[PDB]
Amino acid sequence: HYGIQIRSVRPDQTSQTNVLHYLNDGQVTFRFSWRKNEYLVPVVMILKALCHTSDREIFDGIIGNDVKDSFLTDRLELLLRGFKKRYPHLQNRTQVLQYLGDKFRVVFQASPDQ
Amino acid sequence: SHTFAAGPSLCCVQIDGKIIGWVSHEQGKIIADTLRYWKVEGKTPGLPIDLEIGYVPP
Amino acid sequence: SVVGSLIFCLDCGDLLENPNAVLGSNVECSQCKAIYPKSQFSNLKVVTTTADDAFPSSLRAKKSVVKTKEKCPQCGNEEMNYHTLQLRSADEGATVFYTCTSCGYKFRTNN
Amino acid sequence: CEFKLELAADTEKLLMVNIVEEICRKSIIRQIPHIDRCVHPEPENGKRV
Amino acid sequence: IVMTASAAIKTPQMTLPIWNDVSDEQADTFCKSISKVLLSEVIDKVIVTETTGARSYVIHMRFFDNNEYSEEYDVSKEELQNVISNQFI
Numbered sequence A: 001h002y003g004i005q006i007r008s009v010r011p012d013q014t015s016q017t018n019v020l021h022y023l024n025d026g027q028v029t030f031r032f033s034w035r036k037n038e039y040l041v042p043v044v045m046i047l048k049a050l051c052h053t054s055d056r057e058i059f060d061g062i063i064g065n066d067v068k069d070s071f072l073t074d075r076l077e078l079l080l081r082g083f084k085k086r087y088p089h090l091q092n093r094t095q096v097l098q099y100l101g102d103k104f105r106v107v108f109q110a111s112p113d114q
Numbered sequence B: 001s002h003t004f005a006a007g008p009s010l011c012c013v014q015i016d017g018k019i020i021g022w023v024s025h026e027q028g029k030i031i032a033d034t035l036r037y038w039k040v041e042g043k044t045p046g047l048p049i050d051l052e053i054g055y056v057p058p
Numbered sequence C: 001s002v003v004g005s006l007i008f009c010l011d012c013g014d015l016l017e018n019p020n021a022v023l024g025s026n027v028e029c030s031q032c033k034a035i036y037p038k039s040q041f042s043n044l045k046v047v048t049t050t051a052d053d054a055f056p057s058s059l060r061a062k063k064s065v066v067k068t069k070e071k072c073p074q075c076g077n078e079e080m081n082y083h084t085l086q087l088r089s090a091d092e093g094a095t096v097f098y099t100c101t102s103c104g105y106k107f108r109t110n111n
Numbered sequence D: 001c002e003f004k005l006e007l008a009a010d011t012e013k014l015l016m017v018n019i020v021e022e023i024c025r026k027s028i029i030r031q032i033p034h035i036d037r038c039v040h041p042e043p044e045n046g047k048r049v
Numbered sequence E: 001i002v003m004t005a006s007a008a009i010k011t012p013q014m015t016l017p018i019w020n021d022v023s024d025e026q027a028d029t030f031c032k033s034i035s036k037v038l039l040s041e042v043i044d045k046v047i048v049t050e051t052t053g054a055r056s057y058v059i060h061m062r063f064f065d066n067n068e069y070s071e072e073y074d075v076s077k078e079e080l081q082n083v084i085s086n087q088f089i
Ligand SMILES: [Zn+2]
Pocket: C009, C010, C011, C012, C013, C014, C029, C030, C031, C032, C033, C034
């Protein structure tokens, strides 16, 4: 029943929500809606597609100096290893971003040139 | 860019939904009281009176 | 690079494999493919005390509660509305902004 | 009450606190079935209830 | 009652007539013997300890003092051992 939700508006005053869910398995899920149906993405696919990341820099962005907080460290074990388990490929930013474009090509009405 | 900080032990300074930086809970109230004192005293040329400064204390 | 129950590479920061699921004596990264031996990864100890509010009871509720003037110079007034406010940093003194009601004159005080 | 609990090395990580808390709320020390509480209120209208 | 005639009633109760022989002290130590006692209601905190590299766990469940729950729930020391032995694990 947990989750977080932002409503981001564009400079032309048009909105887009990006709801994050919490799964009881341990992982989290990015949710959006491009047309009148919803779509679910794990956020480590997006954390590694925005910029060129390490995997300790994903850890250091959530964990501050509170490494000894063992609630957060155990829930972040399951988040980063679930990305390596479910997606054993997709190691760098340019490979995660091609998977995310292959799955959202017919729905975002893409062009054959891109 | 060079912060190495996260979590509720700090207060995250955000303008319009982007991180400007990180500062302590005690200092983040001190630097939220000037931002009201300097927006009302209209002598600082970067702070409008239109600004909404929401300090959520720990 | 060892924090908690997880180990990272010392070159690219990628999360290394669990050493109890890899063929022996070597933990290998997936991006740099560096050689980390399974030795000197000895104590992967993590303790997790329960949520401190996870068990509601009539007994847990018992152990929590059984624990047990200014003289304004303009016209003369002692009740004068003031409000301390630390402006710039904690280094300087708190500015005390005074506001009168019998005359309405205002002034501030560094120290 | 302390007890060791080993697993195989093939298995990945379980939380084992959210497991234990959910088991500790379902385990009963003593229970008459389909009765969860028994209250002795003030005696309404003379009789003892 | 009327519209649904629910056998899955929301908050069922049962009124029990106390005898005139048993006093108010024999009646409220009696209602501590019917009302359920969870294992959650007796535990102060649980400290697990995981050392891996065979995944080990040290499940250390800390209770309240024995003078504190044998008065509150009428649960003896030996009966709490049998719940962990035969029911909790
Ligand atoms: Zn590496």
